[PDB]
Design a protein around this motif. Sequence first.
Motif, PDB file in Angstrom:
ATOM      1  N   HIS A  54       0.845  -1.189   0.000  1.00 27.71           N
ATOM      2  CA  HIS A  54       0.000   0.000   0.000  1.00 27.71           C
ATOM      3  C   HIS A  54       0.874   1.230   0.000  1.00 27.71           C
ATOM      4  O   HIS A  54       1.405   1.599   1.056  1.00 27.71           O
ATOM      5  CB  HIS A  54      -0.915  -0.120   1.242  1.00 27.71           C
ATOM      6  CG  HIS A  54      -1.783   1.019   1.597  1.00 27.71           C
ATOM      7  ND1 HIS A  54      -1.316   2.239   2.049  1.00 27.71           N
ATOM      8  CD2 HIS A  54      -3.128   1.063   1.720  1.00 27.71           C
ATOM      9  CE1 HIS A  54      -2.360   3.003   2.411  1.00 27.71           C
ATOM     10  NE2 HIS A  54      -3.470   2.302   2.178  1.00 27.71           N
ATOM     11  N   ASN A  55       1.111   1.858  -1.163  1.00 27.42           N
ATOM     12  CA  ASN A  55       2.149   2.892  -1.316  1.00 27.42           C
ATOM     13  C   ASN A  55       3.401   2.439  -0.547  1.00 27.42           C
ATOM     14  O   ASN A  55       3.909   3.205   0.269  1.00 27.42           O
ATOM     15  CB  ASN A  55       1.696   4.243  -0.905  1.00 27.42           C
ATOM     16  CG  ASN A  55       0.697   4.906  -1.814  1.00 27.42           C
ATOM     17  OD1 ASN A  55       0.752   4.794  -3.034  1.00 27.42           O
ATOM     18  ND2 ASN A  55      -0.251   5.611  -1.208  1.00 27.42           N
ATOM     19  N   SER A  56       3.847   1.240  -0.819  1.00 29.29           N
ATOM     20  CA  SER A  56       4.873   0.608   0.016  1.00 29.29           C
ATOM     21  C   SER A  56       6.141   0.314  -0.736  1.00 29.29           C
ATOM     22  O   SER A  56       6.146   0.046  -1.939  1.00 29.29           O
ATOM     23  CB  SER A  56       4.313  -0.724   0.568  1.00 29.29           C
ATOM     24  OG  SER A  56       5.261  -1.489   1.283  1.00 29.29           O
TER      25      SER A  56
ATOM     26  N   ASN B 174       3.430  16.244   2.669  1.00 27.54           N
ATOM     27  CA  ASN B 174       3.871  15.115   1.854  1.00 27.54           C
ATOM     28  C   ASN B 174       3.238  13.782   2.197  1.00 27.54           C
ATOM     29  O   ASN B 174       3.084  12.950   1.313  1.00 27.54           O
ATOM     30  CB  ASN B 174       5.389  14.971   1.880  1.00 27.54           C
ATOM     31  CG  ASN B 174       6.074  16.189   1.300  1.00 27.54           C
ATOM     32  OD1 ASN B 174       6.272  17.189   1.968  1.00 27.54           O
ATOM     33  ND2 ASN B 174       6.377  16.096   0.000  1.00 27.54           N
ATOM     34  N   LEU B 175       2.912  13.533   3.478  1.00 33.97           N
ATOM     35  CA  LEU B 175       2.350  12.234   3.872  1.00 33.97           C
ATOM     36  C   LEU B 175       0.812  12.309   3.959  1.00 33.97           C
ATOM     37  O   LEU B 175       0.129  11.395   3.554  1.00 33.97           O
ATOM     38  CB  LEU B 175       2.923  11.708   5.178  1.00 33.97           C
ATOM     39  CG  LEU B 175       4.305  11.058   5.110  1.00 33.97           C
ATOM     40  CD1 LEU B 175       5.373  12.077   4.955  1.00 33.97           C
ATOM     41  CD2 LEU B 175       4.526  10.218   6.370  1.00 33.97           C
TER      42      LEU B 175
ATOM     43  N   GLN C 292      -0.688  10.256  -7.078  1.00 34.64           N
ATOM     44  CA  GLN C 292      -0.735  11.532  -6.373  1.00 34.64           C
ATOM     45  C   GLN C 292       0.008  11.500  -5.032  1.00 34.64           C
ATOM     46  O   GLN C 292      -0.050  12.444  -4.244  1.00 34.64           O
ATOM     47  CB  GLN C 292      -2.175  11.987  -6.126  1.00 34.64           C
ATOM     48  CG  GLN C 292      -2.896  12.226  -7.461  1.00 34.64           C
ATOM     49  CD  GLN C 292      -2.222  13.164  -8.407  1.00 34.64           C
ATOM     50  OE1 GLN C 292      -2.134  14.356  -8.009  1.00 34.64           O
ATOM     51  NE2 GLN C 292      -1.743  12.772  -9.579  1.00 34.64           N
ATOM     52  N   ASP C 293       0.729  10.421  -4.778  1.00 37.48           N
ATOM     53  CA  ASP C 293       1.543  10.313  -3.570  1.00 37.48           C
ATOM     54  C   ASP C 293       2.680  11.341  -3.646  1.00 37.48           C
ATOM     55  O   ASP C 293       3.451  11.315  -4.636  1.00 37.48           O
ATOM     56  CB  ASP C 293       2.045   8.877  -3.477  1.00 37.48           C
ATOM     57  CG  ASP C 293       2.773   8.549  -2.192  1.00 37.48           C
ATOM     58  OD1 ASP C 293       3.451   9.440  -1.626  1.00 37.48           O
ATOM     59  OD2 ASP C 293       2.647   7.347  -1.793  1.00 37.48           O
TER      60      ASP C 293
ATOM     61  N   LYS D  67      -1.490   8.442   2.304  1.00 38.90           N
ATOM     62  CA  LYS D  67      -2.294   7.709   3.291  1.00 38.90           C
ATOM     63  C   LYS D  67      -3.635   7.318   2.703  1.00 38.90           C
ATOM     64  O   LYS D  67      -4.690   7.771   3.117  1.00 38.90           O
ATOM     65  CB  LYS D  67      -2.446   8.505   4.584  1.00 38.90           C
ATOM     66  CG  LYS D  67      -1.151   8.756   5.337  1.00 38.90           C
ATOM     67  CD  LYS D  67      -0.378   7.484   5.689  1.00 38.90           C
ATOM     68  CE  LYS D  67       0.590   7.696   6.815  1.00 38.90           C
ATOM     69  NZ  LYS D  67       1.442   6.533   7.082  1.00 38.90           N
ATOM     70  N   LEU D  68      -3.612   6.408   1.720  1.00 40.61           N
ATOM     71  CA  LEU D  68      -4.831   5.966   1.050  1.00 40.61           C
ATOM     72  C   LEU D  68      -5.825   5.335   2.012  1.00 40.61           C
ATOM     73  O   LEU D  68      -7.038   5.330   1.756  1.00 40.61           O
ATOM     74  CB  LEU D  68      -4.557   4.993  -0.084  1.00 40.61           C
ATOM     75  CG  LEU D  68      -3.904   5.583  -1.352  1.00 40.61           C
ATOM     76  CD1 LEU D  68      -3.468   4.455  -2.269  1.00 40.61           C
ATOM     77  CD2 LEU D  68      -4.871   6.529  -2.069  1.00 40.61           C
ATOM     78  N   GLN D  69      -5.358   4.753   3.121  1.00 36.75           N
ATOM     79  CA  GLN D  69      -6.277   4.155   4.088  1.00 36.75           C
ATOM     80  C   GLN D  69      -7.049   5.234   4.851  1.00 36.75           C
ATOM     81  O   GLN D  69      -8.003   4.857   5.586  1.00 36.75           O
ATOM     82  CB  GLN D  69      -5.571   3.196   5.026  1.00 36.75           C
ATOM     83  CG  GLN D  69      -4.649   3.791   6.073  1.00 36.75           C
ATOM     84  CD  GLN D  69      -3.289   4.148   5.574  1.00 36.75           C
ATOM     85  OE1 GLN D  69      -3.085   5.081   4.798  1.00 36.75           O
ATOM     86  NE2 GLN D  69      -2.261   3.408   6.007  1.00 36.75           N
ATOM     87  N   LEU D  70      -6.690   6.493   4.715  1.00 37.63           N
ATOM     88  CA  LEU D  70      -7.439   7.650   5.248  1.00 37.63           C
ATOM     89  C   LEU D  70      -8.208   8.366   4.151  1.00 37.63           C
ATOM     90  O   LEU D  70      -9.365   8.751   4.382  1.00 37.63           O
ATOM     91  CB  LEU D  70      -6.528   8.603   5.952  1.00 37.63           C
ATOM     92  CG  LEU D  70      -5.770   8.060   7.150  1.00 37.63           C
ATOM     93  CD1 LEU D  70      -4.881   9.165   7.732  1.00 37.63           C
ATOM     94  CD2 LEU D  70      -6.695   7.498   8.211  1.00 37.63           C
TER      95      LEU D  70
END
Lengths: 256, 256
Positions: free
Chosen positions: B102-104, B155-156, B205-206, B235-238
Amino acid sequence: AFAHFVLIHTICHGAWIWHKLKPLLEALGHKVTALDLAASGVDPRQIEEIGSFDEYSEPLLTFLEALPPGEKVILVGESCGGLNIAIAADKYCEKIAAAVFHNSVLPDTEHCPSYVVDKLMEVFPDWKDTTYFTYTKDGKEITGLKLGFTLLRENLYTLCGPEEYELAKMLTRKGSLFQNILAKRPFFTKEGYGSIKKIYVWTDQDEIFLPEFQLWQIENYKPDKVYKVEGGDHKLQLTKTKEIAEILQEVADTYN
Amino acid sequence: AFAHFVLIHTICHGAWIWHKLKPLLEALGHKVTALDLAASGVDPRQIEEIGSFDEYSEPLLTFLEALPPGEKVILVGESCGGLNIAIAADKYCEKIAAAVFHNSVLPDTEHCPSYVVDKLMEVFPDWKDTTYFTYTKDGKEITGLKLGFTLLRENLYTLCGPEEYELAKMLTRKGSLFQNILAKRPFFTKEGYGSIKKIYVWTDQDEIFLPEFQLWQIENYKPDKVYKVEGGDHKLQLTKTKEIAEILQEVADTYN
């Protein structure tokens, strides 16, 4: 007017409970400090290192010590945080413009420091799936607790969203009321704690600090001002965040 | 189908980052475990006690050890959590139905364990107001970091709400990439980590794991499946919680 608010969480909680209120107060122009008390939130101590409510309060006392002369704050305590307020006010009353109690215990100066906790336990005796343990510190046996997830869901976070309840499941930690230690503690003083302005905020929909208890506290030790928030739950800073911010603005405009 | 998802936060974070995703996955019928890694979230260790990424991973390894025979999980790692996945898969590959990135970071088996971290630091060299320190553990000098609040905001958590950003300010802790320790670590194995199914989820878009980096990782070590989420932030989980849940449902229906 702008103020410096110091937000004080309850037992088994941490600064994280204020994550919605703090940005709203900042958007009104205020300075906000949200502390982790000892063995709470991301504080590095464990509860078994802490022997009293006074030791538990150390981060609040240390913060107040660090304020330069002439700077005052408005303390805001939720639930058991009113006891931290009383402790702090007996050391730093001159730094406290006012104290705001948020569905909070309201200690007095006529009875022992455990008085309102003892009363709470009579009004609300069944803590559901909460678990208990004992440890010894400074020669005393302390009862610790870990809030039950059903108690959290039904009684503390009744009307909060699932993502807020999830944060409580993830982040609540073992804690203590230090009830027996409070019962032996010197009384809160009239000159310190008794002298501060006290604003009592509550909802009659609180499912743990029930109306009989909160109305009993108001009669026991008359606040300078009472605000009743309609609806919500015990965690008004989650369910009624905007209303809490509006009240705190009025407090900032009234007491300095 | 239902699965048991094990959610793995990134460095300087904790289980709390998953507070929106976990209830959504449970509302689909899944079992969800959201761990605190060592010295993270409410884990009682401090980072200066931790000497490697492998030690940092202990709670994940201990959890996997505790699964009875025949029970498999889907690992989901955000940001640096992909390194925890690789470590875990080299001990418990048979317990892992699939791993979701996940963006990992996406470690490989052809290069040293630090390879993709080294690359990240070339693509994203300016960490803004992040601060650094050093400590020594097991004879090695480790560089720790504390993520800067401007870096967090811009950024995050770029598109997260103010109450989510506030949680990050309150809860993020000192951590480490253990980069120099990774650089000396034995390579991840083809038989363990190399054998697991790998699903790569990302957004272009990260603002920290930039497209050049993520597309480089995909080309370097071909995933079994790639999902690109439109919009959102790191933080796609948000910011894209529902979309992440929908992807994870498809993964549960595909890999067991």
